[PDB]
Design a protein around this motif. Structure first.
Motif, mmCIF file in Angstrom:
data_model
loop_
_atom_site.group_PDB
_atom_site.id
_atom_site.type_symbol
_atom_site.label_atom_id
_atom_site.label_comp_id
_atom_site.label_asym_id
_atom_site.label_seq_id
_atom_site.Cartn_x
_atom_site.Cartn_y
_atom_site.Cartn_z
ATOM 1 N N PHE A 297 22.861 -15.661 -47.151
ATOM 2 C CA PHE A 297 23.428 -15.120 -48.381
ATOM 3 C C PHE A 297 22.423 -14.329 -49.203
ATOM 4 O O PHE A 297 22.514 -13.106 -49.270
ATOM 5 C CB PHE A 297 24.006 -16.241 -49.233
ATOM 6 N N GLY A 298 21.439 -14.978 -49.792
ATOM 7 C CA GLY A 298 20.554 -14.223 -50.654
ATOM 8 C C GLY A 298 19.126 -14.212 -50.170
ATOM 9 O O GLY A 298 18.192 -14.257 -50.969
ATOM 10 N N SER A 299 18.945 -14.156 -48.859
ATOM 11 C CA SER A 299 17.633 -14.226 -48.241
ATOM 12 C C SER A 299 17.125 -12.836 -47.899
ATOM 13 O O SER A 299 17.891 -11.882 -47.769
ATOM 14 C CB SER A 299 17.670 -15.075 -46.969
ATOM 15 N N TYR A 300 15.809 -12.744 -47.751
ATOM 16 C CA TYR A 300 15.165 -11.555 -47.220
ATOM 17 C C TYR A 300 14.777 -11.718 -45.765
ATOM 18 O O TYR A 300 14.008 -10.908 -45.248
ATOM 19 C CB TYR A 300 13.927 -11.204 -48.039
#
Ligand SMILES: Nc1nc2c(ncn2[C@@H]2O[C@H](COP(=O)(O)OP(=O)(O)NP(=O)(O)O)[C@@H](O)[C@H]2O)c(=O)[nH]1
Ligand SMILES: [Mg+2]
Ligand SMILES: [Mg+2]
Ligand SMILES: [Mg+2]
Ligand SMILES: [Mg+2]
Ligand SMILES: [Mg+2]
Ligand SMILES: [Mg+2]
Ligand SMILES: [Mg+2]
Ligand SMILES: [Mg+2]
Ligand SMILES: [Mg+2]
Ligand SMILES: [Mg+2]
Ligand SMILES: [Mg+2]
Ligand SMILES: [Mg+2]
Ligand SMILES: [Mg+2]
Lengths: 242, 96, 173, 389
Positions: B60-63
């Motif tokens: 989801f909100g990972s790099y």
RNA sequence: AUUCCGGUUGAUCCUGCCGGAGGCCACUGCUAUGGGGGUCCGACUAAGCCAUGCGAGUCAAGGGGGCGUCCCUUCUGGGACGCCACCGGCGGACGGCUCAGUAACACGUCGGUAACCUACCCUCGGGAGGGGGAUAACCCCGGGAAACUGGGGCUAAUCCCCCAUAGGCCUGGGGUACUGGAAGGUCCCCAGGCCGAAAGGGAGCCGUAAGGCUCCGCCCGAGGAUGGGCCGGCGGCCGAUUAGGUAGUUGGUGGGGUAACGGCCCACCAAGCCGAAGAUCGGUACGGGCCGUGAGAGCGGGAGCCCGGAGAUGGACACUGAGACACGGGUCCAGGCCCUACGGGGCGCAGCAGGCGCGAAACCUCCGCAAUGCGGGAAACCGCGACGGGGGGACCCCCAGUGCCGUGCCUCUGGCACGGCUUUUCCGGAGUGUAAAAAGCUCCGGGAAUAAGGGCUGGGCAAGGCCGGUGGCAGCCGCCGCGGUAAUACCGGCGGCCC
């Protein structure tokens, strides 16, 4: 089972001694008849796929088994429904690793690593004893297998004794009597997986089972059923235990 | 994008090695299967014709993304063990 | 019987039109900029649960009770609601404002990331705020104490640049 | 690619309309119905192979080809009450066959049929039945009139000549020039009268070859259809079926129709949009309203053919409304605008205080409503279905 | 939150009931931007009736054939290779569906079987000797509208039948080896009978051949395992305007029958058995784990997921098999319905979809065996409307949006005017994802753009003493009560309150 035997098994109804995720899928493997009973054994497929992790799917798990890679008590087993139970030995000779199947402190089955020297023996509890044609004696073991002895030796064997057997040849190499001072390991009940020495034996009328008292290492006494007490040595264990 | 290998485990029964990795890439799209295979092959000096990428997964909100890959020592064993769809999806063989 | 049905996680007022309760709740809603009443009610329920667990354990004895007692204290002071030397009695003196101070929106406002509560809400929802290296887009998320100081602008955000016009206006206050 | 032309049979009661089609099909349908009158319109497909077998050396007289794939015949009731069915049959078909008995002369139904044909500018050829009613006539099985005429005496020939002369004079005061098929050479303003015999198949071959030939003379370019375009057809009837629900029998004449295609049909109040679920096809050489043989399910059909469509929500479909294939929303809107330019030919007038009448199809309901209205009887409600609680 | 508020009088204190205020379930008015998770969706009335498609197969390493392709020599043939049906084996008794019947050892729980059966699977101990026989497939001729079905010819087997031996069962007489709390049991020796096995079959290498060496298999005995049958004590509905009930009924002796004990059924001998601590009869209902509500004590429900029971239009009854009196196997009666050439022949979706009917009340005639399992196979594999994946739906729960900032003005909550910013959501692309797709997730381009309703407004009970209509009419009103030309209560405007 309105008209005949069951052939299926839901995950939610699976035995409580397996390590398995009960809500991930619908069905589970219904084990084949064999050596142990449903409460003290698990199918081979879960050992290959879920426990050790050598396969990701059931299909490639069946390809490993059909090539003859796993030995149970030294014999090749290819059936993915085959049950593996208490005190059995699992050997992978290609990787050279051996395990013994044992109950946990909460009652579930685990694989305990052992040495190659100890992997050739299996302890068998004497569950019953009878007379067979030709006046021979047949010994019936805790895992369902049988052995024959002559009428001369009939006084060396009684129920609840433990016989150390060499596998796969199935030749006797030791007898461990059940008596005060014997070293025992508990296989079922509230006190499962505790171990110690025998202190007392008690009996009751009208077919109620008999009870034993056990002292552990720290000096505590606890009771259990006589048939839940597995003899493993004279005053020290003959096999490796956790 | 930068690749970091987390674990490499051998499987003598099947005859392969299983590789888990992470890819770090802030401000970029999810890496393609071709780029990952090329980088992975070069880092490990492994023949490219017997290497399959099981998956590349973003969060989801990972790099960073997590990937799983397998390497077979023999082509026949690879064709015998893996399903058809994973070989078609990775461009190893052509569909019918 | 019947299979399981999932239940609501908040409780509604016993009477909908009580003047004093309406006044108090309006004050809270305006100060912390919540979207609707149920959001507020959600947090209230959390508080009551904590209290209900403390009342039950003061009156219990045995071995499991002590385990649960220390577990309650540890969970409470991991969230940043109690000082590290607090005792079970101090659970009964918590108020609703203590929980509302732990929301990600309130913490983003207090650290100086935004000039206002509403701006903080938008900053969170549009994805400009990162917590411990991970982007979270829920303004109601309760922040653990151990991760409070790793709260920054996302490294890909426009605001992660000291020359951005809107960031400069935020710094101005 | 040429589609089968659509032929509508018109005439008066007891003038051998059903018998001719039965003889063409070599099956008995005229004895099945009750009262000897057929009150249901149908569509039947005739393969060109049986047409060629019926015909003979006569096909070589005209310099053309028999490349027509087949024929699509439509039957029509001749009773006074079924006016709307006659109007629909006259408007829809490309060619018409008016069957008039020589003995009785003319009837008001014949005049109405001629009026409808003139209104819908449908070319037609006249037939003459009941030839065996003339005394001193020999009967032979399936021989053309040219072969039969030489087997008769002078009296029968002169009686026939007088009767057909009277008929031609009649058409003349109906403002139409008439001449016999073998006695005329012009084929743009003059019709053709074929003396036929339904009971013994006299002169059927001449009528069949004339129908085959005249199709390419008046207008042949309207018979060319693209085989890949969207489907376009019309509704023939609306009826209830066991197990399928409300289905509609349609005649597709433009484009190609496949399963799951979205279609647009003009409903009673507004257009209705639905997805085709079941496409059912009658057996070759079989009346559609008489399922003697089992219907064959079919994935897709090509113009022109009569098929039964089973799709949800067709209980408010209007008989005679066109059906247009539309795969895209813009196509749906264009089809809706096309449907908006369509008139309801027959509207029922309910007085809210009246009797309850129920039939199995819309056409029977229309006929019953007209007959009740002819006798000053109010009608509270009319619909399709069985008598419910 | 272990709670109160309105209503009986000109006024008061009581008893007592009605109403308000909370939660959950079914139907329904008006109105709706997004995503995720889950055990949700023809249960209530009709266990009503159903067109079409699919929901159970598999084995060429058991056996003879037909067709095709190549190789050797070929007059022939012999080979390999691949397809197709038939004989033969195993499976179809599980899985799926519904809740009509049933107040009962049906179900929950603790025990029992020394009174019993069990194909597939596991261990140990043994055995595989000698003969015979037909028949499908295939060739000739057919009959009948069809459903179906006749005669003659020839052939094989892990197909069928005999003979032997092993083995099993019954009864009488002895001995005391085993287990167990306890032997109508197991073991040994005599004696009289009855029943009565097997496929050394198939595949591959070394074999010059002789013959091994593995792989899969056939029969008997002892035990286990798995799946069941049977029995007992205890536990859980309503009615006396139902008071006596039972006569194979309760027990005994002798038998029959059953896999097995038993009035389960017979022959004979007695007069027992149940009951105001509610028998008998009538009503309603599948049981439980659980679920809703409440401070608790309690009160109410038991469709969906798991475990047990029962049924396949209603009522009776059999064949095969280890297991059935069998939902997609058979027979009769009753009751519907369908096809006939009129002589006859067929069918019951309470499986997945779909249709009609009934009602206030309930979805696609979709894609896949990739996952989880089951049946078959030596294996690779093959099939599965189980199960997995999507489609329609204000089913339940969780997390969001419909802008934000600065400076002015205004009726200062809010609205407007300037300047700036962001892109969850929306539109168009690349990657990843998936059996294939679709969603989802990471990037790129455009742009505040694409997004608020429903109820209430006299008191209870938060919110107007404003304006215009109507005039005991029209209307409102859970309750108390408003409306009779100056309505804060009806209808509408403008304000305001709750969510
Ligand atoms: N003698 C004779 N009788 C004939 C001939 N053709 C038809 N008929 C008889 O006359 C009657 C005609 O009826 P039918 O077939 O209904 O005529 P139609 O053309 O269908 N009219 P519709 O259906 O409206 O009454 C039948 O009884 C038929 O047997 C013919 O050529 N000769
Ligand atoms: Mg229930
Ligand atoms: Mg007719
Ligand atoms: Mg009074
Ligand atoms: Mg249901
Ligand atoms: Mg029903
Ligand atoms: Mg069944
Ligand atoms: Mg019932
Ligand atoms: Mg014998
Ligand atoms: Mg009940
Ligand atoms: Mg349905
Ligand atoms: Mg509903
Ligand atoms: Mg008002
Ligand atoms: Mg007030």
């Amino acid at each position: 089972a309105r008209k005949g035997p069951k052939r299926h098994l839901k995950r939610l109804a699976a035995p409580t001694s397996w390590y398995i995720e009960r809500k991930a899928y619908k069905w589970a493997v219904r084990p084949r008849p064999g050596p142990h009973n449903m409460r003290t054994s698990i199918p081979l497929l879960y050992i290959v796929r879920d426990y050790l992790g050598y396969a990701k799917t059931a299909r490639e798990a069946r390809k490993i088994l059909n090539e003859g890679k796993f030995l149970v008590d030294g014999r090749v087993r290819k059936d993915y429904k085959f049950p593996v139970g208490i005190m059995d030995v699992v050997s992978i000779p290609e990787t050279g690793e051996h395990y013994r199947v044992l109950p946990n402190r909460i009652g579930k089955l685990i694989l305990h690593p052992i040495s190659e020297e100890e992997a050739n023996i299996k302890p068998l509890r004497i569950r019953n004893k009878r007379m067979v044609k030709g006046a021979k004696i047949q010994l019936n073991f805790h895992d369902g297998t049988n052995h024959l002895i002559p009428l001369s030796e009939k006084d060396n064997y009684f129920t609840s004794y433990t016989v150390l057997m060499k596998v796969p040849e199935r030749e006797i190499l030791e007898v461990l009597p059940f008596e005060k001072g014997a070293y025992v390991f508990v296989t079922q009940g509230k006190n499962v997986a505790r171990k110690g020495r025998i202190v007392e034996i008690k009996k009751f009328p009208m077919g109620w089972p008999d009870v034993v008292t056990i002292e552990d290492e720290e000096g505590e006494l606890f009771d259990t059923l006589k048939e839940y007490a597995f003899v493993v040595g004279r005053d020290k264990p003959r096999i490796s235990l956790p | 994008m930068e690749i970091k290998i987390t674990e490499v485990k051998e499987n003598k029964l099947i005859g392969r090695k299983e590789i888990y990795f992470e890819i770090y890439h802030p401000g970029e799209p999810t890496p393609s299967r071709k780029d990952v295979k090329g980088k992975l092959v070069a880092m490990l000096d492994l023949n490219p014709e017997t290497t399959v990428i099981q998956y590349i997964r973003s969060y989801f909100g990972s790099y960073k993304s997590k990937g799983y890959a397998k390497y077979y020592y023999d082509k026949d064993r690879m064709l015998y063990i893996e399903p058809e769809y994973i070989l078609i999806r990775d461009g190893i063989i052509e569909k019918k | 019987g019947d299979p399981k049905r999932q239940r609501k996680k908040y409780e509604t007022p016993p009477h909908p039109w009580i003047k004093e309760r309406l006044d108090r709740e309006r004050v809270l809603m305006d100060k912390y900029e919540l979207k609707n009443k149920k959001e507020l009610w959600k947090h209230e329920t959390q508080l009551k649960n904590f209290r209900r667990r403390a009342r039950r354990l003061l009156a219990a004895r045995g071995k499991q009770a002590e385990i649960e007692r220390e577990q309650l204290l540890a969970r409470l002071k991991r969230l940043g609601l109690l000082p590290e030397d607090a005792v079970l009695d101090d659970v009964l003196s918590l108020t609703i404002e203590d929980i509302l101070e732990r929301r990600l929106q309130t913490i983003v406002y207090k650290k100086g990331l935004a000039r206002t509560m509403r701006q903080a809400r938008q900053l969170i929802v549009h994805g400009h705020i990162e917590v411990n290296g991970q982007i979270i887009r829920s303004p109601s998320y309760l922040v653990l104490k151990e991760e409070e100081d790793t709260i920054t602008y996302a490294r890909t955000s426009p605001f992660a640049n000291p020359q951005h016009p809107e960031r400069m206006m935020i710094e101005k206050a | 690619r040429i589609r089968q032309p659509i032929i509508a049979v018109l005439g008066h009661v007891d003038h051998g309309k059903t018998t001719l089609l039965d003889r063409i099909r070599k099956t008995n349908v005229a004895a099945k119905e009750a009262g000897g009158i057929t009150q249901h319109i149908g569509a039947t497909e005739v393969p060109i192979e049986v047409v060629k077998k019926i015909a003979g050396p006569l096909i070589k007289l005209w310099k053309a080809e028999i490349k027509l794939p087949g024929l699509l015949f439509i039957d029509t009731p001749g009773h006074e009450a079924f006016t709307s069915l006659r109007a629909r049959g006259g408007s829809l078909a490309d060619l018409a066959v008016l069957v008039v008995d020589i003995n009785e002369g003319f009837q008001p139904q014949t005049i109405e049929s001629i009026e409808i044909l003139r209104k819908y500018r449908t070319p037609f050829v006249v037939a003459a039945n009941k030839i065996d009613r003339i005394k001193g006539w020999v009967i032979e099985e399936d021989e053309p009139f040219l072969m039969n005429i030489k087997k008769q005496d002078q009296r029968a020939v002169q009686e026939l000549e007088t009767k057909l002369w009277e008929l031609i004079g009649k058409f003349y005061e109906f403002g139409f020039q008439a001449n016999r098929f073998d006695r005329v050479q012009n084929f743009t303003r003059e019709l053709a009268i074929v003396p036929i015999s339904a009971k013994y198949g006299i002169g059927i071959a001449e009528l069949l070859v004339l129908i085959a030939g005249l199709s390419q003379r008046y207008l042949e370019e309207k018979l060319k259809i693209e085989v890949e375009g969207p489907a376009r057809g019309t509704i023939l009837e609306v009826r209830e079926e066991p197990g399928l629900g409300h289905t509609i029998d349609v005649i597709i004449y433009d484009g190609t129709l496949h399963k799951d295609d979205t279609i647009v049909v003009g409903g009673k109040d507004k257009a209705i949009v639905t997805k085709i679920r079941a496409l059912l096809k009658p057996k070759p050489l079989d009346e559609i309203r008489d399922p003697r043989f089992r219907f064959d399910y079919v994935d897709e059909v090509t113009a022109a053919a009569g098929v039964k469509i089973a799709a949800p929500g067709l209980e408010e479909a209007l008989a005679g409304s066109p059906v247009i294939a539309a795969p895209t929303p813009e196509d749906v809107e264009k089809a809706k605008q096309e449907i908006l330019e369509q008139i309801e030919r027959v509207v029922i007038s309910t007085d809210k205080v009246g009797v309850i009448v129920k039939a199995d199809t819309l056409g029977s309901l229309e006929a019953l409503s007209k007959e009740l209205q002819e006798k000053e009887i109010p009608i509270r409600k009319a619909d399709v279905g069985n008598v419910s609680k």
